Write a protein that binds this ligand. Sequence first.
Ligand SMILES: Cc1cc2nc3c(=O)[nH]c(=O)nc-3n(C[C@H](O)[C@H](O)[C@H](O)COP(=O)(O)O)c2cc1C
Length: 147
Amino acid sequence: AKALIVYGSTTGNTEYTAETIARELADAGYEVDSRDAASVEAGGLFEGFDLVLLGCSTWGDDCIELQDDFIPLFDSLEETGAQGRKVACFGCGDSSYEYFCGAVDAIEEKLKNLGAEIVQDGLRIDGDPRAARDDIVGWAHDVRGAI
Ligand SMILES: Cc1cc2nc3c(=O)[nH]c(=O)nc-3n(C[C@H](O)[C@H](O)[C@H](O)COP(=O)(O)O)c2cc1C
């Protein structure tokens, strides 16, 4: 099974999340290709992956903004080959803001509308992902099981 994890992370939290997930997946036998959103190109990006996991933290005060590096890919999601793709989303936020992890919701909804198959509800991490390591591993586990 080949997975692609693309993450947008400004202070490295969701990046830490992506790494924890990648390892969980790799320890399970998946081939895992992780990429920083800042570096990727959207066209055909999901092509050949059995599963795509998109990580993005949430910014904004009264307006949901996606982590800066992710925005270009977000805006080009229709160019990735997501139709029919098993995907799951994750991101770091903080529940004291108005839209907790609203970026996870935005990406998921876009995927859903592109016809991707959301295999698991989005992992929304409130606070430092390092304090939620267990939630991350159980989530990585549950997505492998939802495929
Ligand atoms: C000015 C500011 C605005 C933020 N806005 C939101 C928000 O609207 N919703 C949310 O859940 N988290 C919000 N966060 C929390 C960040 O998403 C959180 O710090 C996250 O750990 C950052 O992850 P990063 O390293 O991957 O990019 C905000 C943080 C800051 C400093």
